[PDB]
């Protein structure tokens, strides 16, 4: 085959692996699907979410943006899946008039579509969505990335390849079978400073689930804070029913129908509508304790 | 006049994030050829030599 | 207006010309421009070693 | 002037009246970022937004800027305090200077 | 693949290389540039002594 | 203490014990159904603002 190079297959593979390597960067940065341990965090970990399907203008421009500016964080870009566009256009007043006269355009040099929404740079693309999520909005200056030199190509006709796995091998000698192999390699770095700075966009409302962990010196108190409003003090040893009562007691008054709580004293799972946060400053170990979003599924 | 033939790409090539001593994965492309043949369009019109 | 392999007329349709009429191989025109990563378009690139 | 239910009737009528009836101009506004979700979501009686006017970044500046009801307008992260979230008036009435 | 401190293969994961692999120090990329005051952008500056 | 969106200093109140004057955002309503003597007990809008 390497003599013949039919349809320029070898030269075509060298460009299409570069596209595969580019695609595999976004899925590691956004969804975290198979990220290396050296990448610190990914956007699906954010505790901010929003629905858009009844009215996208209310979703992005008011209910969404409020969660950022009341937390002191900027909104500067957004990424949207192509499947968002019918819902974006379908946003109307109660007389059927469109809410977005502001609109999006093609490119001669890239496969994306691009434009402005409420003044922010906006990208539409065919693979932003995963599971329940259709886009992201936030301060993309919180993200830095780099690349260590160029994309690299090695070729060999002597090596022995495992076609199976390290748990169930299946070797072929390239030299004994008259085969040739090309090995392609690249190297990147990523850091997201503050994963809580971005809003996950979804078609319709969902509850968010959180793991709350008080692993640390077992005395003192903490405060929860839901949608920017803060609880009374909760003691280290508090029961699940105590925590449920302390959440619903916040004066926006989410119901005992909305909140649910499970686990044990010092280690809990919380499920609620809206953004949950905690401050451990008042535990005997205010540093070992933590809160994070459960990637439920 | 021979026509043209085009190798349309159809393969999902994929790459993986890899540890320092981890064993690198094997992948393969896919294609289908498509061919375009010309066709004629013609007409005649007629007049007296006068 | 005639069949292929007609008894009296030579046509490019005829089976006797098989393999003398090969199309020219060309670029894939139907494929899109290659998909770069959206994160690298919006996030800040920095020098790294 | 309150702006909470309807920012357009806030700035463009109820507010501006208090200046022109006193013989004073309106030339700039300062607004906190917490006002942008109140500038957006100002709507008519059936749900359509009142401002088509909007604001932008600039390449070496932390602020955001644009024209609102014709007037130059700045959005900023720290101008709110207490019940007050912005200012509107004739800023040519302010002079400042630096020594050395 | 292999553990760190594997008995047969040297890796830069290994504890023996601690302190030979120090990162390069860089600028703060996450802070915005130093901030001017909003009043000085709208008010008139005058010469003063 | 209604909670459920209602919050501190949304509200202020003056007058006698009974025959109160109340000031609030939104729509106030009163259920005198348990106030057994007051078969004509009533809520009056005094003014908006």
Extract the tokens encoding E31.
């802070």
Extract the tokens encoding A243.
């925590």
User: Coil, strand, or helix at residue B44?
Assistant: coil
Give the CA dihedral E33, E38, E42, E47, nearest 10 degrees: -80
Extract the tokens encoding A15.
């460009």
- Residue F38's CB is within 10 A of a number of other CB atoms, namely 11
- Residue A17's CB is within 10 A of a number of other CB atoms, namely 20
- Per DSSP, A109 falls in state S
- Chain F residue with the nearest C-alpha to that of A254: F4
- Residue B38's CB is within 10 A of a number of other CB atoms, namely 8
Cα A245 to the chain's mean position, in Å? 31
- Per DSSP, B34 falls in state E
Whether the CB of B25 is below 8 Å from some CB of chain E: the reply is no
With CB atoms and an 8 Å threshold, state whether A193 touches E1: no
Cross-strand bridge partners of residue B18: none
- The answer to whether residues C23 and A102 touch, using CB atoms and an 8 Å cutoff, is no
Q: In chain A, which ranges are continuous DSSP H helix?
A: 9-29, 56-58, 65-69, 85-89, 174-177, 240-248
φ/ψ region of D41 (left if φ > 0, alpha if ψ in -120 to 50, else beta) reads left
With CB atoms and an 8 Å threshold, state whether A34 touches B27: no
With CB atoms and an 8 Å threshold, state whether A34 touches B13: no
- The answer to whether residues A199 and A50 touch, using CB atoms and an 8 Å cutoff, is yes
The DSSP H or E segment spanning A269 is: strand A267-272
Cα–Cα distance for residue pair E46/D92, rounded to 1 Å: 12
Spell out where D1-100 has E strands. Answer: 28-32, 56-58, 61-68, 71-76, 86-89, 95-96
Cα–Cα distance for residue pair D75/A119, rounded to 1 Å: 13
Cα–Cα distance for residue pair A31/A44, rounded to 1 Å: 5
Nearest in space to A266 (alpha carbons), one of A281, A244, A253, A283: A283
Pairing of strands A181-185, C44-45: unpaired
Extract the tokens encoding A136.
């992201």
Resolution (A): 3.0
The DSSP H or E segment spanning A104 is: strand A104-105
Cα–Cα distance for residue pair C30/B34, rounded to 1 Å: 11
* CA neighbours closer than 13 Å in the CB half-sphere of residue D18: 11
Q: For the residues of A162-189, what is the DSSP string, one character each?
A: ESSBTTB--EEEHHHHT--EEEEE--EE
Query: Which phi and psi (to 5°) does residue E38 adopt?
Result: -70, -35
Sign of the Cα torsion C33, C37, C41, C44 reads negative
Cα–Cα distance for residue pair F7/B28, rounded to 1 Å: 63
With CB atoms and an 8 Å threshold, state whether C40 touches A25: yes
- The answer to whether residues A29 and A190 touch, using CB atoms and an 8 Å cutoff, is yes
Cα A56 to the chain's mean position, in Å? 20
Q: Do chains C and D touch (3 or more CB pairs under 8 A)?
A: no
- The answer to whether residues D42 and D7 touch, using CB atoms and an 8 Å cutoff, is yes
Cα–Cα distance for residue pair A143/F32, rounded to 1 Å: 59
Chain D: closest CA distance from residue E26 (Å):
20
Contacts of D97 (CB under 8 A, 6+ apart): E45, E46, E47, E48
- Chain E residue with the nearest C-alpha to that of B20: E11
Give me Rg for the CA atoms of chain C.
26
Cα–Cα distance for residue pair A93/A108, rounded to 1 Å: 34
Technique of determination: cryo-EM
Spell out where D4-93 has E strands. Answer: 28-32, 56-58, 61-68, 71-76, 86-89
- The answer to whether residues F12 and F20 touch, using CB atoms and an 8 Å cutoff, is no
Cα–Cα distance for residue pair D49/D6, rounded to 1 Å: 10
The 3-class SS string of A205-257 reads: CCCEEEEEECCCCCCEEEEEEECCEECCCEECCCCHHHHHHHHHCCCCCCCCC
Pairing of strands E44-45, D95-96: parallel
Cα–Cα distance for residue pair A161/A172, rounded to 1 Å: 6
Cα–Cα distance for residue pair A84/C7, rounded to 1 Å: 62
User: Coil, strand, or helix at residue A121?
Assistant: strand
Chain E: closest CA distance from residue A75 (Å):
14
* B9 → closest Cβ in C24, C25, C28: C28
| Cβ-based contacts of D97 with chain E (< 8 Å) | 45-48
Widest pairwise Cα distance in chain B:
91
| Cβ-based contacts of B25 with chain E (< 8 Å) | none
Long-range contacts of B19-23 (CB under 8 A, 24+ apart): B19/A36, B19/E1, B20/E1, B20/E11, B20/E12, B20/E13, B21/E1, B21/E2, B21/E6, B21/E9, B21/E11, B21/E13, B22/E1, B23/A162, B23/A165, B23/A166, B23/E1
Extract the tokens encoding A244.
């449920």
Whether the CB of C38 is below 8 Å from some CB of chain A: the reply is yes
Burial of A287 (0-12, 13-18, 19+ CB in 10 A): exposed
Cα–Cα distance for residue pair A274/A49, rounded to 1 Å: 7
Whole-Å CA distances, A269 to A224, A262, D75? 13, 5, 39
Burial of A188 (0-12, 13-18, 19+ CB in 10 A): buried
């Amino acid at each position: 085959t390497v003599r013949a190079n039919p349809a320029n297959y070898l030269g075509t593979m060298r460009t299409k692996v570069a596209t595969a390597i580019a695609m595999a960067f976004d899925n590691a940065a956004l969804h975290g699907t198979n990220a290396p341990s050296a990448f610190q965090g990914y956007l699906d970990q954010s505790n901010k979410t929003q629905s858009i399907s009844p009215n996208a203008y209310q979703g992005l421009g008011v209910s969404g943006l409020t969660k950022l500016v009341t937390d002191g964080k900027k909104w500067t870009h957004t990424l949207l899946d192509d499947t968002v566009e019918p819902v974006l256009n379908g946003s109307v007043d109660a007389n059927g008039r469109p809410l977005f006269v502001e609109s999006t355009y093609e490119s001669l040099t890239t496969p994306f579509r691009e434009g402005r929404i409420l003044g922010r740079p906006t990208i539409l693309s065919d693979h932003v969505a995963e599971g329940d999520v259709v886009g992201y909005a936030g301060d993309f200056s919180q993200i830095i990335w780099g690349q260590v030199g160029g994309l690299s190509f090695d070729v060999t006709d002597q090596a022995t390849l495992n076609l199976g796995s390290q748990e169930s091998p299946n070797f072929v000698s390239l030299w004994q079978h008259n085969l040739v192999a090309v090995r392609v390699e690249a190297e990147y770095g990523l850091l997201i400073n503050d994963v809580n700075a971005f809003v996950k966009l979804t078609f319709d409302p969902v509850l968010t689930t959180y793991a709350l962990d008080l692993d640390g010196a077992s005395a003192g108190n903490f405060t929860l804070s839901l949608d920017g409003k803060t609880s009374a003090n909760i003691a280290y040893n508090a029961s699940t029913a105590t925590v449920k009562s302390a959440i619903v007691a916040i004066d926006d008054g989410v119901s005992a129908d909305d909140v649910t709580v499970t686990g044990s004293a010092g280690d809990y799972t919380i499920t609620v509508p809206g953004t949950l946060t905690a401050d451990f400053s008042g535990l005997t170990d205010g540093e070992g304790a933590s809160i994070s979003v459960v990637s439920v599924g | 006049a021979t026509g043209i033939v085009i190798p349309h790409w159809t393969g999902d090539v994929s790459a993986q994030w890899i540890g320092e001593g981890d064993m690198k994965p094997i992948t393969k492309g896919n294609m289908t050829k498509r061919d375009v043949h010309p066709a004629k369009i013609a007409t005649i019109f007629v007049a007296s030599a006068e | 207006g005639f069949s292929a392999d007609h008894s009296q007329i030579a046509q490019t349709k005829d089976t006797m010309f098989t393999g003398y009429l090969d199309p020219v191989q060309a670029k894939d025109y139907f494929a899109e421009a290659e998909k770069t990563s959206i994160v690298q378009r919006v996030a800040q690139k920095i020098p790294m070693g």
